[PDB]
């Protein structure tokens, strides 16, 4: 009982023809493609009620659709613009089973009009203020991830190689490093707070983990910098005394 989309993010160029896949292991007859945009909820592009079948949803314009096999539903953007910049979401269901919709996990698509603009983040960690340690007997580390485009990052924290949820806050949206340029690079901060006892034990390891998503193996690149592929940039600090 799962639905999996081929990609989790992609970057693509204005005008390019685009292909997302969606597969399900439940033998479901019904498959649906939506997009989700802020303020507009989920809107149905195309659905399919059997193998070889399709039907237009509410916003079919610009999109195409293929149900070749029962288990799979391809969505094709004819010519990429930044009106198709969005989050895409596949779902399936059965006709007789009473269970409703199972959703995939989505694929984020961003369409840019030039591919030499995509950068990974670099990631610095800033150790607490002693002033804070003194006043509060708590300690806050800050992680910056900077110089990334497009806005595709997943920031995590690890304490002694074990992901931590408690004591974390990451900005829900990023600020623009150059907020005039149409497609400026982005920056995003995050905070990890622990007790000063914890910060002040030299055995403890703290790692800011950042996974970024840019270019696949396939994409052409003959620029001077490292091909800005999907990757994990981390940063590191130890306990102090």
């Amino acid at each position: 009982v799962k639905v999996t989309q081929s990609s989790r993010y992609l970057v693509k160029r204005t005008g390019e023809k685009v292909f997302l896949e969606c597969v399900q292991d439940m033998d479901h007859e019904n498959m649906f493609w939506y997009r989700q945009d802020p303020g507009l909820g989920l809107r149905l592009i195309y659905f399919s009620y059997d193998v070889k079948m399709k039907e237009k949803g509410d916003i079919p314009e610009g999109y195409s659709v293929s149900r070749e096999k029962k288990e799979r539903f391809s969505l094709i953007l004819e010519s990429a613009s930044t009106n198709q910049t969005s989050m895409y979401l596949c779902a399936s269901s059965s006709t007789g089973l009473p269970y409703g919709y199972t959703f995939g996990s989505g694929t984020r698509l961003t369409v840019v009009e030039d591919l030499n603009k995509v950068f990974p983040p670099e990631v610095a960690v800033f150790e607490p203020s002693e002033a804070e340690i003194s006043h509060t007997q708590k300690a806050t580390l800050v992680c910056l991830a900077t110089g990334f485009f497009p806005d595709h990052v997943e920031l995590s924290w690890w304490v002694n190689g074990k992901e931590v949820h408690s004591g974390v806050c990451t900005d829900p949206q990023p600020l623009k490093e150059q907020p005039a340029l149409n497609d400026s690079r982005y920056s995003l901060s995050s905070r990890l707070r622990v007790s000063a006892t914890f910060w002040q034990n030299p055995r403890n390891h703290f790692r800011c983990q950042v996974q970024f998503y840019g270019l696949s193996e396939n994409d052409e690149w003959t620029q001077d910098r490292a091909k800005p592929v999907t990757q994990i940039v981390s940063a590191e600090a130890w306990g102090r005394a």
């Binding site: 939506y34 909820g41 800033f126 509060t136 408690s166 901060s189 905070r191 707070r193 590191e236 600090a237």
Partner: protein, 203 residues
């Protein structure tokens, strides 16, 4: 023919206060309604489904919703909001009792939950960059939820919005914002300026 509307794209309430998320529908046929939740980093998950079984429908995570045919409505409530309730919520309608056939979704409501900060001591702290190099961030932290944090005025100085972190080791929440630059005149005793409480510790 079916449609759905969610009046209110953004709702902010206090921790422990009443949560109410609206949904209204039109349907030429018998309708079936659903609520979905989308937590910051996860996918869409079912909260509750109205099936013709009964009028008040209970769901997951403390939520409930009454189906009012006379009104045109299926509003989502929870009496006491919890921080963990922050997310986007989506209402949807179908012609199938099970939601097996095509769902029509609304425009969503993002729910933001405001922390009750019990014992505030707002301050501004300077943190050093790592590997013994000196670039500078400022952390404005521990402030009351009344305090908002305006954008910069200087372009090449960066200020994030406030953010809430929840230490459950110690049953302790705290708000913070970050300001940084590389400019020579940047210092943490003047990076924030904007409805910022007079009793801040600055060292």
């Amino acid at each position: 023919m079916q449609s759905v509307t969610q009046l209110g794209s953004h709702v902010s309430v206090s921790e422990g206060a009443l949560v109410l998320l609206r949904c209204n529908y039109s349907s030429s046929v018998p309708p079936y309604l659903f609520w979905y939740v989308q937590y910051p980093n996860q996918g869409l998950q079912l909260l509750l489904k109205y099936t013709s079984a009964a009028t008040l429908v209970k769901g997951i995570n403390g939520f409930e919703a009454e189906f009012k045919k006379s009104e045109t409505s299926f509003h989502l409530t929870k009496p006491s909001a919890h921080m963990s309730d922050a997310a986007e919520y989506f209402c949807a309608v179908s012609e199938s009792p099970f939601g097996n056939e095509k769902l029509t979704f609304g425009t969503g409501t993002r729910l933001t939950i405001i922390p009750n900060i019990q014992n505030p001591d707002p301050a501004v702290y300077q943190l050093r960059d790592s590997k013994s190099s000196d670039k500078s961030v400022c952390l404005f932290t521990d402030f009351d939820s009344q305090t908002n944090v305006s954008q910069s005025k200087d372009s090449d100085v960066y200020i994030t919005d406030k953010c809430v972190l929840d230490m459950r080791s110690m049953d302790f929440k705290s708000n913070s914002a970050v300001a940084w630059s590389n400019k020579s005149d940047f210092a943490c005793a003047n990076a924030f300026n904007n409805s910022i409480i007079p009793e801040d510790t600055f060292f």
